[PDB]
């Protein structure tokens, strides 16, 4: 998920 | 952690975490074009919201799974209460962007439009303060998906803190204890309508189902 | 008038005496049978809700058209919060009727019912943990009736403030400190946001199986068509 | 008109 990735980056 | 910050520090933290008011992409036409612009705007607003949520006291203390779920549940709510907040001093119009004032007469759009306009008129009537707004918006993020092994008493503890934060602001505003409970209730009852506008807004979006991030947020419902 | 003059005790007693009765189900494992029993129950509950709404202080003062609007807006919310309240002393269960106890497994018959079931159970679990009182419940239900459709009005806000003063009074008469009074007030009202969510999710599912042919009652169809 | 009307008056 993009949302999970943006919460990481 | 974040459960030690005073009422003033809580407000300042939220105020400093405030995302900017993004611009949209001035002739006439169009319904497709209309929702094409709102989609492009919301998509870019999402990126700021995600990093805004990180700065929300207590949100970073939660697991990656819960943070995803909370944002998936309340992203449209947070967008709409921000929209309503922008359009406070613009009666009869919605300020989607500083270069985008839409009136009511410009599928299912006008129904939500009037609800958004009514919500903005309510903020104007109550003379909503920015310190109260950032509290309500943070409440939405934590409360919307809290009831959808692991305890969530931490979330309730932060919510109770924001409640104290809200009350502390109103006591400094010279409001009596009775006036403090009442307006507190008035603010939180609006979140019920904000939830409603989101639900009606959500279903209209996955009925016309273009942004990649929005598709993930939308499929969550 | 009539509502703003009453004390918190008179407000509570009025709401308690106005409480609708707990109806019984018809004397399930099928989609048709399941929705059939729920539809039949909900329709008969609506009739009692309307009369309960009449005995809600301030609701009478409203014009007929506004009374209609508020009921059309919050009827499913009011049905759900009542269900949740009935299911408090039945953890992991939903008490639609004294002769109709249901767990989340029996909601697998009807599409979308499982999701709403869990949200209903989570709400009932929250009332339990908060130890919600009946005096507080009747206040929350009256708030839903007056608030949910108020933005789709000045007098209604005044009555809402009265119920707020009433809730604080109940908590103050319970031995809670000022900090605990606001806080619990906030915790209760935030749940109404979830009740709104369940209603909207429940509404679109009812409308889904309305165009797809269980035959909803004429009253239910009217309430449902109010949400397009 | 509506059934809700009659039940609200009766
Ligand atoms: O993909 C979309 C398109 C529009 C919306 C919004 C809204 C507002 C009006 C509306 C009406 C309908 Br029907 C559906 C969505 C929306 C919205 C956009 C930006 C904001 O800052 C706030 C809200 C969000 C995501
Ligand atoms: O026609 C109907 C069918 C079901 C419901 C209800 C609900 C509850 C669970 C549910 C799940 C789905 Br999917 C659809 C509707 C409903 C309901 C009925 C009675 C109550 O006291 C409370 C709620 C109301 C009217």
XYZ file of C-alpha atoms and ligand atoms in Angstrom, chain C residues 35 38-39 41-42 45 75-76 79-80 83 86 96 110-113 116-117 120 202 205-206 216 220, ligand 2:
50
model
C -33.776 -9.927 6.950
C -35.227 -7.837 11.260
C -37.400 -5.890 8.811
C -39.037 -5.934 13.996
C -37.682 -2.594 12.775
C -40.180 -0.394 16.378
C -34.320 6.567 12.522
C -31.638 3.941 11.894
C -32.736 1.897 16.222
C -29.053 0.982 16.442
C -30.017 -2.263 20.035
C -30.100 -3.764 24.907
C -32.613 -7.388 18.740
C -26.805 -11.287 4.755
C -24.144 -9.359 2.827
C -22.598 -6.462 4.740
C -24.291 -7.543 7.961
C -22.107 -3.785 10.805
C -22.475 -6.503 13.448
C -22.467 -2.787 16.773
C -26.637 0.069 7.150
C -27.041 -2.028 2.366
C -30.802 -1.783 2.881
C -39.417 -3.808 3.011
C -39.446 1.583 6.015
O -35.239 -3.448 7.366
C -34.313 -3.416 8.329
C -33.548 -4.512 8.595
C -32.612 -4.419 9.586
C -32.412 -3.252 10.295
C -31.417 -3.172 11.391
C -30.089 -3.377 11.225
C -29.199 -3.816 12.280
C -28.172 -4.643 11.671
C -28.301 -4.443 10.217
C -27.492 -4.879 9.193
C -27.812 -4.569 7.900
Br -26.748 -5.163 6.439
C -28.943 -3.817 7.647
C -29.731 -3.381 8.649
C -29.408 -3.696 9.951
C -31.997 -3.038 12.756
C -33.247 -3.541 13.027
C -33.778 -3.404 14.267
C -33.075 -2.771 15.248
O -33.582 -2.657 16.473
C -31.833 -2.299 14.993
C -31.297 -2.425 13.746
C -33.184 -2.171 10.016
C -34.121 -2.260 9.039
